């Protein structure tokens, strides 16, 4: 008798995530929105193949902005391209607080829920993401009807479970009025990883590319000058280091942290550039000749 109607953990592909990060980033401080297109298969996997933004909101994520007309217009085009996909849900950005929906935004969310139950709402914070998986949650709408049914525990079931974190006021308020939180996990294929990496032609070529001989000599001499400074501290540190922990001994008989370490880093950078250039130089001269 009962149905499913649960929020499944959302599989976001590599291109779709980048499109959401880019949409938001240009889009903020203004609240903006756009749609998510994908295919849902099984009762566990929704894959977000692609997204595009369906005209960006003004003040609030307004109920005016949700447009069946634009949604319809875009959808028939896709059919002609020979990629017919369905709206899996929709995403929006809030810079207000991490993982929070606005008051206007919950009403807007309801239009998508009526269309498909598997409509999801993704909050993107470009302000507070410097890993870009961080401060993104998938959410689901809480109506009066949803709370009476007990749809909210029903969502945690069928996946790994996920609650938000950013800000104290936004977590209590959001949880009660605005949403229930559910999980996003990521699948990106090996081809997606290969394109992600940015193989680049000059990037590898530099490794062989020979730097000036005078420049190595000059550098060798400069590097020695840093060690000289460290060398006064280093002569004093070495006299007594007859107990345990080198760092304590070194600070105690003068020389902040490790005078040995500083000295070593200084040679390593010079040695690294000189060593590779010599390896490269001998090789190129013989090969080209």
């Amino acid at each position: 008798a009962p149905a499913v109607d649960t929020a499944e953990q959302v599989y976001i592909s590599s291109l779709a995530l980048l499109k959401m990060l880019k949409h938001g980033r240009a889009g903020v401080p203004m609240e903006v929105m756009g749609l998510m297109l994908g295919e849902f298969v099984d009762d566990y996997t929704v894959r977000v193949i692609d997204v595009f933004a369906m005209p960006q909101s003004g003040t609030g994520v307004s109920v005016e902005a949700v447009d069946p007309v634009f949604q319809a217009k875009m959808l028939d085009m896709l059919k002609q391209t020979g990629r017919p996909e369905m709206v899996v849900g929709w995403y929006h950005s809030h810079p207000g607080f991490g993982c929070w929906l606005s008051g206007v935004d919950i009403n807007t969310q309801q239009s998508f829920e009526a269309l498909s139950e598997r409509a999801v709402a993704v909050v993107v914070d470009p302000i507070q993401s410097v890993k870009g998986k961080v401060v993104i949650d998938a959410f689901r709408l809480i109506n009066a009807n949803m709370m009476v049914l007990g749809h909210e525990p029903r969502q945690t079931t069928s996946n790994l479970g996920h609650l938000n974190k950013p800000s104290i006021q936004a977590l209590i308020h959001g949880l009660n009025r605005h949403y229930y939180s559910i999980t996003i996990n990521y699948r990106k294929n090996e081809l997606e990883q290969k394109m992600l990496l940015n193989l680049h032609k000059k990037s590898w070529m530099e490794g062989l590319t020979l730097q000036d001989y005078s420049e190595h000599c000059k550098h060798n001499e400069s590097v020695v000058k840093e060690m000289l400074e460290l060398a006064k501290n280093y002569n004093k540190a070495v006299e007594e280091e007859d107990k345990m922990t080198p760092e304590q001994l070194a600070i105690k008989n003068v020389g902040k942290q490790d005078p040995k370490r500083h000295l070593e880093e200084h040679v390593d950078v010079l040695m690294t550039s000189n060593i590779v250039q010599c390896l490269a130089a001998m090789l190129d001269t013989v090969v080209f000749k």
Partner: protein, 32 residues
């Protein structure tokens, strides 16, 4: 290297001492 060795020498005294303490405890028991 030299620093870890000076410490290593100090560790040696405790580590030797443990094998002898056991000896002394075994003997106090057998002698009563």
């Amino acid at each position: 290297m030299v620093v870890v060795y000076l410490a290593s020498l100090i560790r040696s005294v405790v580590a030797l001492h443990n094998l002898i303490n056991n000896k002394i405890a075994n003997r106090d028991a057998e002698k009563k």
